[PDB]
Amino acid sequence: PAYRILKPWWDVFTDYISIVMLMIAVFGGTLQVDQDKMICLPCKWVTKDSCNDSGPTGIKYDLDRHQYNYVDAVCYENRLHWFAKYFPYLVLLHTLIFLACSNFWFKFPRTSSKLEHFVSILLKCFDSPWTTRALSEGVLDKKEGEQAKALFEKVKKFRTHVEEGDIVYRLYMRQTIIKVIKFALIICYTVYYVHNIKFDVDCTVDIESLTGYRTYRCAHPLATLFKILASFYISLVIFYGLICMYTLWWMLRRSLKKYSFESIREESSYSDIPDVKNDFAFMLHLIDQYDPLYSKRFAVFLSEVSENKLRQLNLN
Amino acid sequence: PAYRILKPWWDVFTDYISIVMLMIAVFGGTLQVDQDKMICLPCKWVTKDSCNDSGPTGIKYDLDRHQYNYVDAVCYENRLHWFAKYFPYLVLLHTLIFLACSNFWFKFPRTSSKLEHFVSILLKCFDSPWTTRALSELDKKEGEQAKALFEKVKKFRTHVEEGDIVYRLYMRQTIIKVIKFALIICYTVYYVHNIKFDVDCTVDIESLTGYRTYRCAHPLATLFKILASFYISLVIFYGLICMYTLWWMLRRSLKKYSFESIREESSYSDIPDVKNDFAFMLHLIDQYDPLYSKRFAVFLSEVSENKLRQLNLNNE
Amino acid sequence: PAYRILKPWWDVFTDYISIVMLMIAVFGGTLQVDQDKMICLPCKWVTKDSCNDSTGPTGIKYDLDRHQYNYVDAVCYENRLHWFAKYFPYLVLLHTLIFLACSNFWFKFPRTSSKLEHFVSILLKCFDSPWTTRALSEVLDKKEGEQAKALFEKVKKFRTHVEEGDIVYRLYMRQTIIKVIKFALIICYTVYYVHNIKFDVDCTVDIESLTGYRTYRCAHPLATLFKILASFYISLVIFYGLICMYTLWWMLRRSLKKYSFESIREESSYSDIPDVKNDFAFMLHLIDQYDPLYSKRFAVFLSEVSENKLRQLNLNNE
Amino acid sequence: PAYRILKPWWDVFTDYISIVMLMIAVFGGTLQVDQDKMICLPCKWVTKDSCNDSTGPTGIKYDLDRHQYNYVDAVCYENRLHWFAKYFPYLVLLHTLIFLACSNFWFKFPRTSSKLEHFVSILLKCFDSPWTTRALSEGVLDKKEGEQAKALFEKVKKFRTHVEEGDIVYRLYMRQTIIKVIKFALIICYTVYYVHNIKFDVDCTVDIESLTGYRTYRCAHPLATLFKILASFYISLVIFYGLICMYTLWWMLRRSLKKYSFESIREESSYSDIPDVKNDFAFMLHLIDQYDPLYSKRFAVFLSEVSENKLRQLNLNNE
Amino acid sequence: PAYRILKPWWDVFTDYISIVMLMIAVFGGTLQVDQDKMICLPCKWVTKDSCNDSGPTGIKYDLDRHQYNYVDAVCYENRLHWFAKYFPYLVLLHTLIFLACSNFWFKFPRTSSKLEHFVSILLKCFDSPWTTRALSEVLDKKEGEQAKALFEKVKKFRTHVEEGDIVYRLYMRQTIIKVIKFALIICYTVYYVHNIKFDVDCTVDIESLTGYRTYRCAHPLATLFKILASFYISLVIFYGLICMYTLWWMLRRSLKKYSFESIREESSYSDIPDVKNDFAFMLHLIDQYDPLYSKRFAVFLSEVSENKLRQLNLNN
Amino acid sequence: AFRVLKPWWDVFTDYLSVAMLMIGVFGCTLQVMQDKIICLPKRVQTVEMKGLKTDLDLQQYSFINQMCYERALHWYAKYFPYLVLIHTLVFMLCSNFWFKFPGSSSKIEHFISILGKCFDSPWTTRALSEVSKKEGEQAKALFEKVKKFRLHVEEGDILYAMYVRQTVLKVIKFLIIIAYNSALVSKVQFTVDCNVDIQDMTGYKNFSCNHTMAHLFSKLSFCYLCFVSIYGLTCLYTLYWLFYRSLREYSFEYVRQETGIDDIPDVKNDFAFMLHMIDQYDPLYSKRFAVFLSEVSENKLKQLNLNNE
């Protein structure tokens, strides 16, 4: 849409990673809702309240189906690690936080309005025929001349209006910092707690008053599937974090609050384009990271020499 | 939509909070519908209506599967707190009321028509080429369109400055939202501790089952618990945002929009002070983007209209 | 789409209440289809077709298979559960569909749909006509004068074709009366039968030859939830009543088939605006109910003095 | 979309009735796929393959496994439960599909679809033409407007020669209405005859005594009353559909739709040379009259050659 | 869409095959979640930990339903081959990788911007009436100025695109990765498709809990997974063959050198220069979609056409 | 405008294909969850009847059900919906065989553009009125465009060959489908006998099983057979109309019967076939487009233009 221009390769990569993690979170949540149980069999042989487990005939436990369901529910709630139960919900929450950090740049009214104004007159300068006339370096239409003069004045006004404050650059930096800290915390806690997603779980829940057995051995059906999902999420979070550190290094490599038009002023005829600062510099850095043609077509409006050529050609 | 300009950051943030509050209401709704049950096991060793408990083998209760199902249903209906059962429906009703309070501004035909026609004249004034050149301080067709638009603006001012229905409706919506946030916080905080995993039930079905007291495990309790906690946090954030909204309507009189800085900066110093609904939507526009009100203020000034007729007279 | 200007606050409120009623209808329907059961346990102590309700405790052996229990459930759900507790969501869905049909039969009937579409097109064209602004002010181009004269003839022809009868007004009246009557019937029967949605139901179905027991006590697990739905539905219907009742009052306090342009003719310069009647009067009353500005600036295309001024201006540029 | 002008009130009524009937079909189909069971219980004492029906009460022990019960359920559902109760939603869905195909056949048949689209286009762009307004109101005209007016005049002139000769649309609509009414008759006969066979209590005698031990089982179809009320609602909707189709048939029989007189138009307006149209053109003009007569009121302007002479004079003066 | 012109027949064929693959993976995953289980029976007579296989009456195992569920879960986790368990997830991952490789051409911002500019100017040339006149070879002033502006845009576009070969390089890399992925998929899937069997023998050693060691099981969705794999492999082969053809289409001709000798011989303008690198590559792809677009774009490249347009405008 | 080139048989077969898709999807979703078998062992261990006790757990019953679903149920009864889906997808892909190849698609677009442009041209009406300015120049340009179309399409016959190949493919596929479906429709039955050797687990060898969704699968198979038969009758009529009249030759003698112009040449091969297609849509386009073909009409138009200028 209109905001795809201000989305560099790191942003679109993080967006695709985010929707992929959202998909695996939805899958894990559906799995948790439907098929997440645990089959618990009592240990007939016990030793100090622990599972001794020392034509064959099957062991008779004298337990009803409802006692088995009660044992399942109690051991699932008590002696199953919270990660193995709430991993998809944590993944969904982390993905939602990441998406909110990515899209708060687009939703906050001040920054959204500034982005809309920038995108709007960049599209208008692209549609301006005098952009083509200036980039080539005859006859001027009255409507075309009025549109060109209005676009020049709008460019000057907007440059004065936004170069004072850098709220958009500061918000983007804060979003990147929050995302990289989130990734650090996510990778730390997920790497720590991934080994607790096990298949065989020994539960000692003390329901001997109701069931008659003390300790039970449980099999978690969706244990290794959840472990595979956790490893996939770890890989995705590692990729997201590497992209985020690259983006932060892009911020810290050079001052994005200071854009120099030296290369364009050397290539083009107009060599008086000022070195703009702060929010305008950041917004121009973004489109330079998408396509340098936008800066090439838009630098002609900033220069006063092109305005000098404008007033001479308008008079003619 | 077309009313995104009239929605400040508090309106858009609470709408996203209303969306996630809707989603955990949906999530809780299908969870309760599908697998909200409780496994109830009778306490065989009843002692003062308790479970005293006065290798190991299973305890035979001599209960059929259907007797267990009946005990489950009866103790779920009777000895389970109503909050743990109807938490998702309560959340759904509350977020539906919040969404209704947020959208009643755009759904009520009087205020909807007023907002629509304000937005139309504001966007068409944004597209007007006259306002940029007037702020800087002309074709025959362009001057005629601006004069007709000037007539439309003054007619709108006369039509809307009489009443304050929009501002009063917004105040009422904020009052209802904050008082419902308060009520939600009190009752939810009071009753969130009743969502327990382990519940003792005593329903007196001894004539049918054989036991008086049964100990029940509610599987979807702790998850519901954390959902409730999550919901509370969302509501808390909602309320805080609503608090600031209340502050924004009480720290300053919104029925009087002063153009003091506006006429101080610009050449036109005769701009009058608008009132009532016009003042309210101008404050809202200032909250979204000051530039819209800045370039709209010229069409309220008689001096700039004097500059308009002389430009039209000189052109003729 | 373009019919929002013909929908007042009562119509919008009834539409949203019907949406909520449809939502609860779908929810109750899914509940009834999937999770509506009836857990029935035999009463081993029977006393004249009644449950007598009469050393560690031990469960009572009933000597019943699972399939005998399922048969008992099916028979006591079919024969002894009240019809309201079984068909409440379907009845709510039927009532919501009836309300929606009553609301949208105005726009689905081809004669009234064509009349409303023609009225909306003409009024929108007059709203976007620039001469009306000038008509509210008191130059014009050749194109603007031509299109304004063409719109004047279009308005005259539309008035001639519409002001003859009141099919739109009669249809709106009939829909309002049908909605009020439906609300009354729904409230009466729902309030009367809402008490039959009970949790514990005693069933006596006489399947002694197949099960061995005569009387059973059943638990309807969803019943209380349905009760919480049912009362909620009643509340919505109550709202859907009062709003609709207000519409009836609004349609009977004054004759909607006579629209008076007295205020517009006394505020604007043109004081010759005639009083329209019948369907024209009804749609102009509804349009005023949306926003008085639409009718106020449509009044200039009904006044002959505006036509005289337009003809004078056309002679000037002619 | 653009064919809403060609659909009278009976077509709209039948379309919405078909939508509701298809909803009934989908609901019944989902119910019959998911929850359609048959809980069968054996008769302990039988007399000539018939149940005899002969200190607290104790349950009857049948000595049957869960899978033997499932087998008995499957056998008696397949054999003894009536075919109408099993295939009611599928038959309903088939009937709705046939009704929808019959209603929308002439919108998909290319021979009639081309004529219908041509008629709709040259009547709508006729309707929004300014020459209609100026003629019905009865110096200078826009060049584009005049060229368009003469272009639509020539288009109507060729359309009249292209359609008036044939009656394919009228015959197709006749055949669709007749097929719909005979389908309604067949449905309201067979459904009404077989609706009484949807019963809750069904006796099954399937001879599986060598696999279960019992011969007769008293089954119970749970979705029998719900299917009964669904069948009653379907019968009511088919009754409404049939009454609407008989009204359409009576409308098409009483008035000859292969002729159309513009006598009312030519008397109110000054143009009295509008010819009497016939065959398919007359039929769709009658349909448009059923939708809104003022569309044909404006369309009759381009059918009169006096209007042609006036337009030619005005265009020659402009030229 | 807007980029359908760039996609040849092999690309859209691979897209349809990938969509069918995604449908297969979704179906397999739905089956795996819903009705993929194991149901296992103990071997009553066991000699050396193996089933001895030593009117009729049923064998009594004295096992509860929960012991059966535990046996099923353990023999599903430990003795079912991982291919039968995770084939739907594997085809899901492979199809997602194929789709990502296919859409990385349009996703990467640099190549996406270059392709968007190329498609926009090609579509503007295709509808240009001056192109029709040049094919035919008295024109409107605005038409001639549009033709001149489009000529200058073509010149600056050529100078912009001929410097780099990133687009062709990216397409080559995507094709290479797709071929390698096809080869690996075919190799591993053909190697492991035989492990999806119906009768599996499990020796899980749960004698302490159940009473038996060896059980013979039966996987419901085994022979249905044996056809879903065997149908999937076929598609991969087809995919690979198509990809192989694309690889062959890279090797027989040099994609960085589009010689206009065929076009300039037929056309009157026999002075059309030969384009290079990315511009040559997308012109070759234009030929693969339809050569008429490249033929029409060829007249906006020759200098004789520029001289003719300048002479026409001078006459104009 | 691609729907104009589609006659009644083409849209009829398309809607039949959508019906087949619906049948296949319904059969597939039935087979995914509802498809199950119920098995009971044979020779198991005022009359008071007593049930026979098989002494089998539920797990053994499920094991027997699976063994008999795999090794006793016919493969048709298990894979009928997937076969329907695959065959109808092949039918749908081959339904537009003559529409998708770029040369034929370009020919279709060129012919329909030409026919529509001369349809909108008033010179047709002027010439028909004669027999029975700027627009003259436009008519002359459209005439030289018609001549260029004659030089571009009439010499080839690839479209007819592609249509005949598509029709033959549809007919042979319909023959195959009818043959195997009619051969294997008797295998879908309710009661089946299962003789798997699981005696070492369950204790029994001979079982009697019931395919619960066998009546529904039989009805679905018969409905699919009816749809296939209707599709094949449609394709057989298409082949008969293809062959009994030589579609490589289009004759304008029926126009000559009422139109005086006789210099009209008869077009052949691709032109003749696709004019027959437009005749199948409606003959009015063909009998109207006749006047744009002959050369004496161009000479008359040239003379009229010379007189007017």
PDB file of C-alpha atoms in Angstrom, chain A residues 122 125-126 131 135 264 287-288 290-299, chain E residues 110 113-114 117 156-157 160:
ATOM      1  CA  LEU A 122       6.521  11.919  -2.657  1.00  0.00           C
ATOM      2  CA  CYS A 125       6.544  14.688  -6.900  1.00  0.00           C
ATOM      3  CA  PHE A 126       6.767  11.381  -8.767  1.00  0.00           C
ATOM      4  CA  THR A 131      10.548  16.123 -11.981  1.00  0.00           C
ATOM      5  CA  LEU A 135      16.055  15.129 -14.307  1.00  0.00           C
ATOM      6  CA  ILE A 264      23.044  13.483  -6.030  1.00  0.00           C
ATOM      7  CA  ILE A 287      13.373   5.494   0.879  1.00  0.00           C
ATOM      8  CA  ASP A 288      17.070   5.318  -0.035  1.00  0.00           C
ATOM      9  CA  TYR A 290      14.024   1.011  -0.586  1.00  0.00           C
ATOM     10  CA  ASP A 291      14.896   2.779  -3.854  1.00  0.00           C
ATOM     11  CA  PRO A 292      17.435   5.566  -4.549  1.00  0.00           C
ATOM     12  CA  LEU A 293      15.288   6.719  -7.497  1.00  0.00           C
ATOM     13  CA  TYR A 294      12.844   8.341  -5.057  1.00  0.00           C
ATOM     14  CA  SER A 295      15.595  10.558  -3.634  1.00  0.00           C
ATOM     15  CA  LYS A 296      16.871  11.279  -7.155  1.00  0.00           C
ATOM     16  CA  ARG A 297      13.421  12.430  -8.289  1.00  0.00           C
ATOM     17  CA  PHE A 298      12.707  14.360  -5.062  1.00  0.00           C
ATOM     18  CA  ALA A 299      16.021  16.187  -4.515  1.00  0.00           C
TER      19      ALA A 299
ATOM     20  CA  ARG E 110      15.350  -3.613  -4.637  1.00  0.00           C
ATOM     21  CA  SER E 113      11.119  -1.725  -7.129  1.00  0.00           C
ATOM     22  CA  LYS E 114      13.012  -2.474 -10.351  1.00  0.00           C
ATOM     23  CA  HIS E 117       9.216   0.362 -12.602  1.00  0.00           C
ATOM     24  CA  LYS E 156      16.766   7.166 -17.672  1.00  0.00           C
ATOM     25  CA  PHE E 157      15.288   3.735 -16.891  1.00  0.00           C
ATOM     26  CA  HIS E 160      19.186   2.947 -14.074  1.00  0.00           C
TER      27      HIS E 160
END
